[PDB]
Amino acid sequence: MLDDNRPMDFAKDKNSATLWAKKRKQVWLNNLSKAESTSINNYIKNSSEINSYSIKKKFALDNYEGIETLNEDLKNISTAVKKSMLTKPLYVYYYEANDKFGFNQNLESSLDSNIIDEEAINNFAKKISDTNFIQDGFKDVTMTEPDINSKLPILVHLKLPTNTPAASYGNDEENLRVLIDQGYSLKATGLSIVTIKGKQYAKVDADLIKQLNFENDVISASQWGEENYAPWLKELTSNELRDINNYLGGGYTAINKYLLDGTIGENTSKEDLEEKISNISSALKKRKIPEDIITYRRMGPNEFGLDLNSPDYDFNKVENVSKFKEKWLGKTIPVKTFISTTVLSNNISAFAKRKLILRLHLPNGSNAAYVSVAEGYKNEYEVLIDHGYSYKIDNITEYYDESSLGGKTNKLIIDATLI
């Protein structure tokens, strides 16, 4: 009922925005548990810390204790906002940085700070297409077109669909914000220039979408693999099953080395390698990925032309993160090798200290399989991707892994699209 006579978009009508939010926020607060009241209060005081923490937690090792009360806030904020789901779409607004669209070209013209550079905006148009932008942590927004200057170059005009958990909160009763639950992504649906207060901003029209992404959800992940790839396991020829099994159990080292640059062990044969590759690849073509899905990979430095002892690989120095972002952002990288990925965001013991975390949008219809359906892959959550695809690099986001086992280092989250 609270959405009855509001529009989908309040535009600049700050007064209508307020009336709607007030009645909504009052009812929602009286529906909260004390633990939820407290956690939403914590989100007002330090939303940044909480959101940063959600990232650390999801990419952690299994035995990650973390910080107790922020585990609580993560849960309570999530259950809180689910008590305030929209009954019809709501457009919302917020100023945004270059970073969140993986864009590092200045959008301002050099001549007039009020005027957007034409070639910049053209590259931006290319860059934001064919990409779902994952939004980490919670996202709080506003109800109307901002009326004040921004130092940021972009205005996002974001459509929240029906049933989005989206709660009215805040200290300023005449400018209540909207608190959006975890787990969502952004898909652009338009680009234009808007002029607010004499200045031009790049306006991104976008839809808020939900991609399948299990993060730490082990029960859901495996249930998905079983349902979608047990028949696949049934149909494997003997040799296909054998050589998938060889690959998985340690054969990958020699197989991907060979795919990468043709290396053969002296006791190894060329023909054995080619036969193994042909049986694995043929297997990976038998049942296309049935729905868009995020998968993850702890990547070694060699995958970006870096050695473990290369100086450029020290991401604890600000300068090295910048030159890496300079080098790979927007780039398409061919992948000659099979790609071992995991559908869980969890760090993995054998690869705990790798600094490069792939977060891959794996499209419907890709030649890949949930191989851990096979017997004796308890605790394995692998999707294996056919060789010869490519990475479109969408974004690079740093976070700091404080853990002793993780390597007490900054690490780079590489959002990418398989093409």
Ligand SMILES: NC(=O)C1=CN([C@@H]2O[C@H](COP(=O)(O)OP(=O)(O)OC[C@H]3O[C@@H](n4cnc5c(N)ncnc54)[C@H](O)[C@@H]3O)[C@@H](O)[C@H]2O)C=CC1
């Ligand atoms: N790495 C991961 O996140 C996952 C690993 N696994 C399991 O781990 C084992 C595979 O270990 P990995 O080291 O991931 O195998 P891999 O053959 O992909 O990696 C071997 C080494 O070669 C490098 N490399 C890989 N692809 C390359 C390319 N295109 N160009 C240049 N260098 C490249 C890697 O950085 C790594 O140092 C398998 O048993 C698999 O089941 C399973 C799921 C995910």
